[PDB]
Amino acid sequence: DCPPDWSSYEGHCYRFFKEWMHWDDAEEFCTEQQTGAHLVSFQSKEEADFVRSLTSEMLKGDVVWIGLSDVWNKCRFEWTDGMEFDYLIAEYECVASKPTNNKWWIIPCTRFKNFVCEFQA
């Protein structure tokens, strides 16, 4: 049972927000709206197609934050020669989706963008 303004699709509820925030603030903001809510997560091309239909109140050529962060430091690394890698060498980068063709862009987490929150009902 999701409160108004938050649209629904396949058991979950999503809502586009016209606030301009850094990824960390957007994520935090989402968790402070409703219990267990977070930045939107895409489990299927279909789910992204739906969410794309909620970005109506947005400028274009721009992107929307989705729930992926520090995507480079989370990686494994290896040298091309026999040297073994000894386990933060990358910048804090996050993922935003462009609502035109739903492709994802990896950009600095400090960019101010609109976002979509999501949660289970």
């Binding site: 489990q43 962060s69 520090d70 480079w72 020669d81 739903n102 492709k103 994802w104």
Partner: protein, 133 residues
């Protein structure tokens, strides 16, 4: 005796190449320049960092900001987070390959001693490393 034009450090031969090539092509080039050749590998906490940084600083054209090294993201996926912020696992992925940065290079700022990951298709000068002949 390292071949002419190559510098020695802790039992190996090194050389900075001004030619700009994408990461994969640079690695191939290094393997062709000497048997045992590869894009340089670096033990960050040793004097190897300063030695390689110096080789680039002293020979790279003033305008180039990067020099490839042999480090790359191992992951096959385009981005490395295995789960979304909501805790659900990442399966579906639709990343614009141009924002994918899996290849590492020495950065000009601070003297080519620190690393940064870049789009692998970018063409940059680089450093090769090989065992002595």
């Amino acid at each position: 005796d390292c071949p002419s034009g190559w510098s020695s450090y802790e039992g190996n031969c090194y050389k900075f190449f001004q030619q700009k090539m994408n990461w994969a092509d640079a690695e191939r080039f290094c393997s062709e320049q000497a048997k045992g050749g590869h894009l340089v590998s670096i033990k960050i906490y040793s004097k190897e960092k300063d030695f390689v940084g110096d080789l680039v600083t002293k020979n790279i054209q003033s305008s180039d900001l990067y020099a490839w090294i042999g480090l790359r993201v191992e992951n096959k996926e385009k981005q490395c987070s295995s789960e979304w912020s909501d805790g659900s696992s990442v399966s579906y992925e639709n990343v614009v390959e141009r924002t994918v940065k899996k290849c590492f290079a020495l950065e000009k700022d601070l003297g080519f001693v620190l690393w940064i990951n870049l789009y692998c298709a970018q063409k940059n000068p680089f450093v090769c490393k090989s065992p002595p002949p």
